[PDB]
Structure 1
Amino acid sequence: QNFLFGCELKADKKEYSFKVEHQLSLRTVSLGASAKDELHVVEAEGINYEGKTIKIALASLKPSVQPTVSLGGFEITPPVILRLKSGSGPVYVSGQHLVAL
């Protein structure tokens, strides 16, 4: 089954934690109307193939250059934290929460 997913990362609330008791498929990352005209970096933190915790950079966005990046359905296994690493925000992430059996 396939549900809408989204989160907002901002100075207030730099992180979103995807957990639960499934797959997230990330679709776009985009800067809100009010973001400072500067580079924003959004990162994902989770476990790699070795079982080590890593931080990976998903996108670098700037309002006057590239305010949206489309990820094409980047599937991630829970758990993952999405975080605004730099830039004012707000930054949005959209995608799907997929459930199977």
Structure 2
Amino acid sequence: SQNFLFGCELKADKKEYSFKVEDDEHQLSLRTVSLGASAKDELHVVEAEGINYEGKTIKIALASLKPSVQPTVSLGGFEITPPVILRLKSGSGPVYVSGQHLVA
């Protein structure tokens, strides 16, 4: 309903970003995943970790990106319910993630 900016940066020496919220309805809406200019020229895979419909945590790949092929990927508003961790699975980074934090 209300909407605010969200972002994070993943790199080899900080690979994880933990999205959680203190109880007060929230979604994280992912929009883009992009590589910074100094990312190495190799495939970077970013993954999300969160609850499936049977209440178990799963790890899913969100994007695979390479500077010389495909530096940005737009997700078009992929909504996830917190808690979620974003994780860098390969490549040096930096990788950036943008989106919205939604609050209803």
TM normalised by structure 2 equals 0.94
Residues 1:5 and 2:9 aligned together: no
Q: Aligned-pair distance for 1:73?
A: 0.2
Mapped partners of 2:57, 2:101: distance in 1: 22
Q: Distance in 1 between matches of 2:63 and 2:11?
A: 15
Unaligned runs of 5+ in 1: none
SS of alignment partner, residue 73 of structure 1: strand
| Structure 2 gaps, min length 5 | none
Deviation digits for residues 21-78 of structure 1 (CA, Å, limit 9, x no counterpart) = 9110000000001000000000000110111111000000000000000000000000
Q: Percent identity?
A: 100
- How many pairs align? 100
Q: 2: CA distance between counterparts of 1:32 and 1:62?
A: 11
Please give the root-mean-square deviation of Cα atoms over the aligned residues, in Å.
1.1
